[PDB]
Amino acid sequence: HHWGYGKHNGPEHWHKDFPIAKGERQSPVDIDTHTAKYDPSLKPLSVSYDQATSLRILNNGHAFNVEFDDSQDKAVLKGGPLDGTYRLIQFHFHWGSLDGQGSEHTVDKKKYAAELHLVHWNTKYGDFGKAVQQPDGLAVLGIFLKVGSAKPGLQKVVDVLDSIKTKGKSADFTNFDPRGLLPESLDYWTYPGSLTTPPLLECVTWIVLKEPISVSSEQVLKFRKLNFNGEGEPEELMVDNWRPAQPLKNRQIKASFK
Numbered sequence: 001h002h003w004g005y006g007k008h009n010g011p012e013h014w015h016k017d018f019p020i021a022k023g024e025r026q027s028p029v030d031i032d033t034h035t036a037k038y039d040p041s042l043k044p045l046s047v048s049y050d051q052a053t054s055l056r057i058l059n060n061g062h063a064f065n066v067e068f069d070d071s072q073d074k075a076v077l078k079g080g081p082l083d084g085t086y087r088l089i090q091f092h093f094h095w096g097s098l099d100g101q102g103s104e105h106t107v108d109k110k111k112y113a114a115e116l117h118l119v120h121w122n123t124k125y126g127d128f129g130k131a132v133q134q135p136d137g138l139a140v141l142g143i144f145l146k147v148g149s150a151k152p153g154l155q156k157v158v159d160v161l162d163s164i165k166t167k168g169k170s171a172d173f174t175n176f177d178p179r180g181l182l183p184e185s186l187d188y189w190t191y192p193g194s195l196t197t198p199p200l201l202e203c204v205t206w207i208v209l210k211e212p213i214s215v216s217s218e219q220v221l222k223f224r225k226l227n228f229n230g231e232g233e234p235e236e237l238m239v240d241n242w243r244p245a246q247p248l249k250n251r252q253i254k255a256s257f258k
């Protein structure tokens with residue numbers, strides 16, 4: 001009886017195995033755009049993905065992860081609110097059963113169809129497992145998805161999903177360029193928070209881009225054909241794999257822009 005997104009094991013249950021679910025810096029949150037303060041001391045984000053080395057795509061039973069070689073400084077995030085250098089390890093998405101829900105963060109209570117998370121770890125902690133034990137261990141770049149025009153740089157991801165339909169399936173996934181998933185603007189909001197899935201560790205500097213990317217209805221439909229279940233288990237569509245907004249508590253969201 002492991003955590004998930006169903007009636008009996010969904011986000012309102014997680015606190016029983018992971019009491020930090022009710023902690024002081026949980027994610028996601030609603031971004032109230034009128035209360036976020038412009039911080040003119042915040043630097044432009046530096047997204048350096050030209051040498052990124054993707055390896056593999058994995059269905060882990062709660063999303064799919066595109067994994068990268070993080071054994072050297074090849075794809076790094078720096079600048080913005082960050083001190084030092086954060087290495088890209090994986091990206092994944094959260095999405096809905098319907099185009100009106102799926103994002104984890106919300107903007108003035110608006111839900112997007114999906115949310116991309118580019119996960120990075122602070123190189124001063126040496127590995128990801130050490131970094132998640134630190135309050136500044138991770139930097140997650142969050143990008144909203146809205147349904148409209150197709151995102152051409154997403155299609156290589158969409159087309160491999162048939163090969164990883166069920167929990168525990170993986171496929172080689174080399175030479176994928178994550179620059180093709182970024183919007184034009186790197187204007188962002190930032191706040192201190194957590195992993196949005198168990199173990200819900202309070203180790204994340206969240207950086208959420210203001211400009212969504214557009215994906216097509218056909219692209220997001222292909223996400224919704226994935227399965228939470230393993231092969232030969234009853235089919236349960238991988239949809240609504242999002243945690244809702246958590247209390248902001250004693251936090252301020254800062255804006256990089258006016």
Ligand SMILES: Nc1ccccc1NC(=O)c1ccc(NCC(=O)NCc2ccc(S(N)(=O)=O)cc2)cc1
Binds near residue numbers: 117127128129196198
């Ligand atoms: N790599 C490493 C290096 C040295 C030693 C140990 C390791 N650890 C692993 O290999 C490993 C760690 C965790 C794991 N599952 C739970 C978890 O912590 N998920 C992360 C996550 C959850 C959530 C988010 S979100 N949605 O962006 O907030 C973003 C990220 C599975 C595998």
Ligand SMILES: [Zn+2]
Binds near residue numbers: 093094117
């Ligand atoms: Zn995520």
